[PDB]
Amino acid sequence: KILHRLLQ
């Protein structure tokens, strides 16, 4: 997920 990925 764009959010989930970006949060990492």
Add this chain to the structure above:
Amino acid sequence: HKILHRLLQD
């Protein structure tokens, strides 16, 4: 008038 208006005007 609006119903709300009338219920206040009571």
Add this chain to the structure above:
Amino acid sequence: SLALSLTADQMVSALLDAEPPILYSEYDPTRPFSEASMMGLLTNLADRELVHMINWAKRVPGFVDLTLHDQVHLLECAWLEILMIGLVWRSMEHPGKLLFAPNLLLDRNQGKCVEGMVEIFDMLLATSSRFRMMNLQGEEFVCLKSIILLNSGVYTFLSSTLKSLEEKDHIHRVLDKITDTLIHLMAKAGLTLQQQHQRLAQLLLILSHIRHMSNKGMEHLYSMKPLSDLLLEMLDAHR
């Protein structure tokens, strides 16, 4: 202008005296559920509560100092929030259920049968549990409800005139009084100074959740098109 002189205790007394009653339903629990029937019951109940709410509003200090337009606007803005905070208050001692009326409980299995209601249901439940865990008192509750009435519509419009700015500031002064009154209640209940502003914040943050639920609810209301003339009017204000 008279209301700006009220003491904390006098504010609590006025608000407690003005409290609307808890109303009952004509609900017959001895037959299978019907979505259309339950909606009708909820609409009828809501419609009867609104009449009580309008007369309660006139008894909130400072409210009748406003012109008719502003009284109307505040009620139009906050009506579903006020119904909802009432529901979560009276649902408190009843985990897992929404106590619409003492004789009309809506359980979660049944709420699932209402198309799109379960998400709002769970939010209402969480809010009620929150209050129960906080051991919200009746005195604090009536302060919060008054705050919703005065606050929810106060930022809808720009002020174009000094006069308009002043009526806006009249509302803010009354709100400052209810904040004082909330703190007064907490101090008289034993709470340390830190506890008092922490409890005040927790309660006011819950009002953001109530706004959230009201907006989601309003969405569903002008999607199923039950509604009484008064409810259509109140709804129209948001549409």
Add this chain to the structure above:
Amino acid sequence: KNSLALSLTADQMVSALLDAEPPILYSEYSMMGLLTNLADRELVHMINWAKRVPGFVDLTLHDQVHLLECAWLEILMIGLVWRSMEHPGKLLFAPNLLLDRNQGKCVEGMVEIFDMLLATSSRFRMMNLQGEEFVCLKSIILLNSGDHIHRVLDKITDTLIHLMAKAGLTLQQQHQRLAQLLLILSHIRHMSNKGMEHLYSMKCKNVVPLSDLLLEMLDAHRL
């Protein structure tokens, strides 16, 4: 549990929140096209900002995703309102995109929200809201949008009070100001909720292409 937010003194919390601030971006050089592109780029900064809010990365990743999903439009809005305070009656979307109230008219449903945003801006300016209070409010929006999370919200409340006290406000004025700011959060929740409805409507009407991140963020609420 392990938590930096609960380890910080009030002055450290303020310092850390100030350090975490996203930059103010410029508009690219149709109105709906400009605003969308601007919000898209702000969202990327917002995600990295949240990772710098003390307490946020101590939450589970699922919690973190959920808070950003619920709070993103609230946070864009209070940001816009903050940078518009010096421009009464106007919305400073960016230094090269200053819109008067009435430029909100071209787009269906937008000017009513503009009025609410401007009311908010006028309120903050009249209250003389300070930068340090603002970054506290922004973190409260993030954490309240959705038990450890509540301990942190308590801590940011303490920090707000602290800032007021250090500024020389009496106890009564602190309680009143705390309440005034938190009640404005209810209004910011309102605007976000109405905007989210209009955004979904715009997606359906297919007249402006919402970005991937915006589409994904939008899909969060209709869920």
